[model samples]
Target: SHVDNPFVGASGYVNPDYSKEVDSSIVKVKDVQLKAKMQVVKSYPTYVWLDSIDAIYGGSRNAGRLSLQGHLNAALAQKKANTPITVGLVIYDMPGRDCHALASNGELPLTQAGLQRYKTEYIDVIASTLANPKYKGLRIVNIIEPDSLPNLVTNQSTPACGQASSSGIYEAGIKYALDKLHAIPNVYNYMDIGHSGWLAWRSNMTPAISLYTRVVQGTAAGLASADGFITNTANYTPLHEPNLPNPDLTIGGQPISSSTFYQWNSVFDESTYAEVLYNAFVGAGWPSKIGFLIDTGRNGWGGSARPTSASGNDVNTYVNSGRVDRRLHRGNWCNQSGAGIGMPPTAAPGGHIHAYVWGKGGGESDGSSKYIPNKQGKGFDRYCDPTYTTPDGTLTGALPNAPIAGTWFHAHFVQLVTNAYPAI
Candidate 1:
């Protein structure tokens, strides 16, 4: 029954014993691999949605090790069967500090020694994974510091005063990483963009776009590294209110909407905002080499619940506000919510205005105690238990258990990858 939904796929790695607890009655890793091979035989392709390469460093060290092992196992399994699966890595940690601590330091200029230390330890691990020959054809996407760049530019609450680095410095860091991992042929890199609301105004868009352009173009003023950029990791509100039409209103004139956009309806309601953002990207020269990605993990939760005939209140909001546009959400599973939009595996060469993807696989929640069901048990256990409530007040009990343990916090992380995949 669960496998009935063709768009479904597991995000994150599973504990070696995950198959023991679940009703392997439907599908398992072996089943997925078989299906992958069949798809390939039929000229259809299958891929896995890898949210994190390892457990977040600094917090739950054991879980981190388990995550690493899980990824290695999954990679090996896919290789042994000649099935192609993609893994997305989040450079979430900066040693010497916990998750929050490392996040706080993102905006500050690291001392030469500190910067080098990070590159050698954390960044190298990621690069090394991509370089592994066993995973040669593995599709890897690197979402460098999900909210780090966004927070650096917008969130002033951090201790790091510099927040957003100068264009040259930022590009240098990105280029350094790219150069270090150049050996990996299938690896692509993407820098995450904040939600539309945060980036809706030109005050913010100018610096962000300037930095992106410079980096991608490799102009003397920009970073010569990086493939492209992604927008909105988790929050799905539009960049402009529903009715605003001046694409230039915000630097590129992307749509803008308050976080409340989700409060009214879930499913396609978000499409209005997506369209506006897509139009803005098009207006801003639509660099062919550079692309865009969206986080649709949680959208399904809201989407599935949206009334088939809800007053076009959401749509009207886009039109009335002079912001009328729509884009596809390509996320499947995240955390415990099954709310996601499914898309065809391959996108036409230039048909994709924004790349639709299933970056986030429904799984676990963050390591923070703030998340419901906590991090004490397996992600599937928590998700199947029904009593768990996600941070946003959504009830995800209806969703199926994650295929692996320790993947509950995967939703937001998956969202981050969704944007990264297309841009890369």
Candidate 2:
């Protein structure tokens, strides 16, 4: 019997300038590609993810066109290897950069025709790619605008500042996509539900749960139409304990007393924040067909040292008070530190989330840095700044140095680690 299979892949959130980016180096791609080839040569049966297509290509109008082409070309090159690779295409960006852009806009952007246009652009790319014969066997997990559905349903605005939308425009957008994209075969569509922390604390769980219910039920596409749902693309921490105090309370009325209740732990929490999301899906009744993907690119170290692990208790306190029953996973990516503690061996058996992927590749700059490349010098230093913060006023801290934090470099690193161990 197989003991465990730890496979890791990279997300496409990094800049296209893979050469200059610190997290991604020219050597990184070769290393990861070679590693993948070796796995295939040995028939290890591994999985990889392109975490995103449009985002990596930047928010340009031709992003989908260029991004998908690049991904296909890369996959084609890798096909020569002996391993079986599973890739994911984040479909969320096709719709106006989803929450990121909306948050930046100071409100939801879907209210106007802009969201409709985004949908149109996204569909064009999907239809074109699917029609191509070269990508016939490609297996893609589509994350439909992470947090869009829940944000829409709950009218959730900014996480730091509470900005709410009117009515159920968010649900309408999801329903529209489900109606349009449900027919694609080889493509498994999942609506991301933000991390458990966000769900339980940042936003109201009741509304979040109701949002899922409405989407799964109202879409006519039905729960069967969707492969599943995901949560927390870049947050970490266990969704069960810190997020929920009673633990016995049914999420949407589903009991969570046992592992059978849901697939609780996943690298997505620390890496991609999908751990809590996977649990939500199972609790909602789509366990078999539903699986989650984690972005384990940055979370190598735990969190900053100053606050002490006790600060983690704040989340627990929130949970116990019933102030929040949701927790954000360790949302660290490619940085040298802050990844996750490495999933335990026994943790894999309860039914692992679909895969632990590198959802956030290195070298790419976040919105805070004006989308500048995280190259060495002040640019790189600026890029190293923490991307997230806690309620206790502590920052997540800077990422590691260049090449170490580069996209391709981190990609290869993940491939090596996951391939050699069982920690996904």
Candidate 3:
């Protein structure tokens, strides 16, 4: 199984709760797509990524928050204003977040002391916040952590990943998060898995799924623990890879692909990735009933329109155009340029997929690349530097430097809107 991931078939995972009110709400067809014409669908919720002191960097006071109670209060207020409002939240304050990367690094260090504080302050606070009976009727899809599980793989792949999971906190936090959230009946939580392009290889996906399986199994509630796993969380891998070759396109001696839905089989598409992981998780003992959710906010990639490569540069030389995603690599987490609006939000985008979520806002900047010689905050990592080639030798570069994580990039917002699929 380790050699080539023998578990490639859909492993018969069906949801008994698929008809529950929560699942019903998830699969219900809302006017989210029609609404994305202006702003993102109102029914759709943007994750308030609480990775540090601020939920969103430098936003209005009404925007981000520094306190747990404040965030809960805001959710309650939103709910009070209207019924059936769902609030999307990300609890990414895990120690040593983005260990190999700097864009979305967390505030706390990865240590036992940090874990103590996280459980008492962070985890406990989340429990308290959700416990408010006033908010019980509201739907809350809590995306546990973005790069946490993937960090385990990054640590093994590169020398840059420092002590990403030094302590057992990564495992403990996930287990704790699930157990805590399980106590709250209304909240839906999803374990975040990086996009297919990143962990496409059997070697990488194997351990990642196993780790998630262990976390879920270790928790008190078992597979019924967290709602399910989420893929393409915040990453811009497309839902499908269009513009197929006459036969199949092969690169770096990887899997071949064709454009149409059934024929489509790119390692970069969320659709394919979900299939792979769904099988992998099921094989690894995840309940057959497990479902999937994807973040389709920035994966559109101008659809049929893409930057022409008539004149080649270090960047854009090998850009995969007309695919669902346009990321250079799984590691490229900066504000990607030419990324267009992807499929508007919807429920259960086929198969075991539960919903296509706008987990990351379209205009929101991933991170900045301007690193001063000595800086107060996280300076730019080369990954964010459009001028620098990814050390992997893809010669991929050209995503312009961006603002701090969560900073609203007004210009990027306009680009996404302008190139939105089906045209804004």
Candidate 4:
């Protein structure tokens, strides 16, 4: 029972928990327009992240701390009888999860026991709930594991990632998830492809596609196991690089893609990345109808610094001023300082992209600014520290004084509202 695109004609379920937070946030705003705009943002569908086993029981840093069942119940409540609606859930917890990063690791070990727990306690529980006949009317979209399989492509050099690759945990865990969740007729599983900046590198694309194909094909349902793929999940890559729309655009006869920032990546923005991946995957023999999604959650780098037009200077100056993604480096993925809310959730925004979603939904910190002890398996990462300089000699654009990953940070949320693009 393969499902068609769930987003095509359905109203996305608006999380009451997130709406309440937005309502409380707007009370102090003096600008009437800004307040109105914030309300509009609140109205859009923001995906609920069930990132850990505890999260399934209302244990994450979500402001409301709503359990998976609680959120699903909210979705049922939000829907009108006989009407179509979609609820987006990020199915993120996995063994040795987020292998390359230290911020939001999972509770599961990288052993066979971990894989079993992921299948039984995690995936099985989620599948049984989703398979409930009571909720069959609602479309459940499970954004499977944000940074799992992609690590095996470019990050295998990292010890944990290498182990994940050699031990077959990442692939097997994802296969188990796809098999279990996709078995439910209403569930649509979109595998996470890191993002344009990370995987769009020339050397990374082929290996990335091969690895994704391998996992999807290995599933019990085979290629049918995955509904589609998702990019830019929780990362701040813009939907469109307006000024430098064409990475191959020339500056004094030199290609802008050749600049240090872009580093010859053919696709400069998330949209292009989605199309490239969609074409590659389909051409690689994936389902032709399978689409992709872009997490335009925090890529709206639209404050006073957003470029209005392309620059005519040298390659470095041209890209530095022309790009809308204002991050110091494409590798910076924490709670960025200058980031704003991006395009609100929308259905069928052209190309092979089925939707542009707030998959991460800004306001939750990517990780803590400094290490804080936690029962969650999260660890301290230098990338989340605003003061720390990356190995590439660039400042980590992450905001300071942020709380642990998934916790609500009011200061960061306020900044997102203030800096929203299109003057919101």
Each model's Cα RMSD: 10.5, 9.8, 9.7, 2.0
Per-residue alpha-carbon lDDT of model 4 for 270-363, expressed as tens digits? 8888888888888899878998988987888887878898665788898887788888888888888888998888898786788888898777
Winner on lDDT (2 vs 3): 3
Task: Give lDDT tens digits, candidate 3, residues 1-424.
Answer: 1111111221111111111212233233345653344433323445566665444332443232334455455655554333354566777878766766734456666787877777776777777777788766556677887888777874655433435554567888788888998778777778888775445464777777777888888989887777777888777776765453222444444323432222333464677778878888888877776778888878877744564332222112223433345555545656777777677656655678877777876766676657534222556666767777775554334356566556556556656766776455
Model 1 residue 251 lDDT score: 21
Ranking by lDDT: 4, 3, 2, 1
Task: Provide TM-scores for the models.
Answer: 0.55, 0.57, 0.77, 0.95
| Superposed model 2: Cα runs more than 4 Å off | 1-66, 80-84, 94-108, 152-167, 198-203, 236-288, 302-352, 369-424
| Model 1 alpha-carbon drift over 4 Å, by segment | 1-60, 64-73, 79-84, 94-113, 156-172, 216-224, 234-286, 303-305, 309-350, 353-355, 367-424
Overall local distance difference test of candidate 3: 0.61
For residue 286, what is the lDDT in candidate 4?
86
Better of 3 and 4 by lDDT: 4
lDDT of each: 0.39, 0.41, 0.61, 0.83
Q: What is the lDDT of residue 214 in candidate 2?
A: 67
lDDT of 3 at 79: 49
- What is the Cα-based lDDT of residue 344 in candidate 2? 23
